[PDB]
Amino acid sequence: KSDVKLLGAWPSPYVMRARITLNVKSVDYELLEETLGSKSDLLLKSNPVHKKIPVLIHNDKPICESLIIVHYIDEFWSSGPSILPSDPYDRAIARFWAAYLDEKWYPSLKGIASAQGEEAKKAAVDQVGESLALIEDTYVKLSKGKPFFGGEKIGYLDIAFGCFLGWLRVTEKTSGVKFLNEAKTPHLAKWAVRFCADPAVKDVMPETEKLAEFAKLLA
Amino acid sequence: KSDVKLLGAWPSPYVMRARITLNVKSVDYELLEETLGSKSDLLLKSNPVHKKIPVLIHNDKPICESLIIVHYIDEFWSSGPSILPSDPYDRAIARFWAAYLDEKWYPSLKGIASAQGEEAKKAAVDQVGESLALIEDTYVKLSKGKPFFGGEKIGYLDIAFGCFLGWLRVTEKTSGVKFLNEAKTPHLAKWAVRFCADPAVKDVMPETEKLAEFAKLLA
Numbered sequence: 044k045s046d047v048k049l050l051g052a053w054p055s056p057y058v059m060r061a062r063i064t065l066n067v068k069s070v071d072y073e074l075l076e077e078t079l080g081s082k083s084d085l086l087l088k089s090n091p092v093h094k095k096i097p098v099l100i101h102n103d104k105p106i107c108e109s110l111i112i113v114h115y116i117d118e119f120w121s122s123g124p125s126i127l128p129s130d131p132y133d134r135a136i137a138r139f140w141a142a143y144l145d146e147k148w149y150p151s152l153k154g155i156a157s158a159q160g161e162e163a164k165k166a167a168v169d170q171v172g173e174s175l176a177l178i179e180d181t182y183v184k185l186s187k188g189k190p191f192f193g194g195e196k197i198g199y200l201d202i203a204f205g206c207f208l209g210w211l212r213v214t215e216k217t218s219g220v221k222f223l224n225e226a227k228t229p230h231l232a233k234w235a236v237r238f239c240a241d242p243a244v245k246d247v248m249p250e251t252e253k254l255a256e257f258a259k260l261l262a
Numbered sequence: 263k264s265d266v267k268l269l270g271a272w273p274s275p276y277v278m279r280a281r282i283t284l285n286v287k288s289v290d291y292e293l294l295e296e297t298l299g300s301k302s303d304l305l306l307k308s309n310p311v312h313k314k315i316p317v318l319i320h321n322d323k324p325i326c327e328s329l330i331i332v333h334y335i336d337e338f339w340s341s342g343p344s345i346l347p348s349d350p351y352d353r354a355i356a357r358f359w360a361a362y363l364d365e366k367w368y369p370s371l372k373g374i375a376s377a378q379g380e381e382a383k384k385a386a387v388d389q390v391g392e393s394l395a396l397i398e399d400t401y402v403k404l405s406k407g408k409p410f411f412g413g414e415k416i417g418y419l420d421i422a423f424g425c426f427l428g429w430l431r432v433t434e435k436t437s438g439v440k441f442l443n444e445a446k447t448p449h450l451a452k453w454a455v456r457f458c459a460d461p462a463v464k465d466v467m468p469e470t471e472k473l474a475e476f477a478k479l480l481a
């Protein structure tokens with residue numbers, strides 16, 4: 044906490060990645076919230092390039108990009124539970140789907156709410172459904188019967204994907220489409236319950252209607 | 263070569279990342295070229311998600327995304343010269359600037375040639391100049407007097423940035439603006455000569471006018 048500070052905002056899924064990873068490692072830290080609508084001077088100093096949260100400040104050194112932050116926490120506090128797979132190929136696959144979720148899935152998740160002003164543009168709803176099917180079978184292959192993407196304990200892809208679960212449930216209630224359930228994604232449904240109930244996740248996973256209130260609050 | 267195949271295209275900077283990393287590790291491999299304009303069925307099978315090159319096929323297992331590929335090669339062939347820094351913070355900084363070059367710099371490099379049809383839209387030229395200044399001082403801080411971003415031998419960020427040098431020189435000749443030279447970027451200029459002349463780079467670094475011919479060939 045004296046040595047570790049996290050620049051972020053409570054409803055941010057990427058900030059949650061750092062929070063979860065820090066909890067897994069039992070690393071204490073000070074949380075500095077960003078008033079959304081404007082950017083703090085500390086965020087500007089700490090991340091002049093992207094001006095984005097989260098920013099992990101460890102011993103007065105900035106570490107930017109959530110996935111890079113997760114890697115860093117795992118590699119520095121190496122004596123704690125590993126966040127990344129031990130095997131090089133498992134590592135590459137882990138990293139691929141995390142990058143996939145940020146480049147493709149999450150923007151397409153935002154795409155359901157967004158559009159223009161015609162009728163039925165939401166092939167976005169179809170694509171989110173397809174992606175979740177891709178993730179469902181990805182889980183089956185990676186988990187191999189074990190409760191998480193990373194086995195016994197939550198891992199890199201658990202954190203990378205599970206950090207979106209709140210915003211997913213927001214999208215579900217508003218769009219009317221339940222993407223993640225027992226019918227469509229049976230394995231992910233069971234995993235989602237366990238992940239959201241994990242001690243390193245449950246308190247930093249924001250309430251759904253609370254997130255929804257923020258979403259509707261957002262201009 | 264029997265065990266390692268690289269799906270790509272010769273003028274691709276991201277494919278070059280894999281080629282360079284493989285050379286550093288002295289890992290032999292078969293090269294399968296993509297006819298640009300269409301996508302091979304192997305590329306479609308090997309990368310159904312992004313349908314992008316490069317794809318490293320190691321023991322009939324696909325590894326996608328160049329930076330993930332670089333990580334994988336470094337972590338699998340771990341007995342060879344390290345491509346990533348040993349220190350966790352140096353690792354995070356390495357990864358940040360690599361990600362920066364792909365998200366911000368290279369798209370803004372393509373931005374100089376691209377536009378609409380008015381006059382003088384190229385604040386793109388200014389931004390490429392600014393970014394190179396950011397990279398120049400980044401080099402000074404990371405190299406610490408040593409010839410490369412990674413010290414003695416080329417490293418992660420050497421490969422991540424140096425893979426763009428051919429397309430940079432193409433942009434320079436066409437735009438008329440020399441971005442990387444002794445006046446603007448003195449340290450990068452000296453490094454560029456060494457990197458391009460490194461045995462793991464020199465043969466897979468395409469000729470400039472040859473790249474330019476491809477660029478003008480490209481519709």
Ligand SMILES: N[C@@H](CCC(=O)N[C@@H](CS)C(=O)NCC(=O)O)C(=O)O
Pocket residue numbers: 055056057058094095096097107108109110
């Ligand atoms: N690639 C970045 C994404 C960061 C990001 O976009 N954060 C959003 C919300 S989670 C934000 O509020 N950024 C400040 C901004 O977008 O201007 C990461 O993984 O850290």
Ligand SMILES: N[C@@H](CCC(=O)N[C@@H](CS)C(=O)NCC(=O)O)C(=O)O
Pocket residue numbers: 274275276277313314315316326327328329
């Ligand atoms: N993020 C990807 C970028 C891959 C990429 O965009 N490759 C380009 C040229 S280097 C390409 O030809 N992709 C096939 C396509 O864009 O459709 C990586 O680092 O591998």
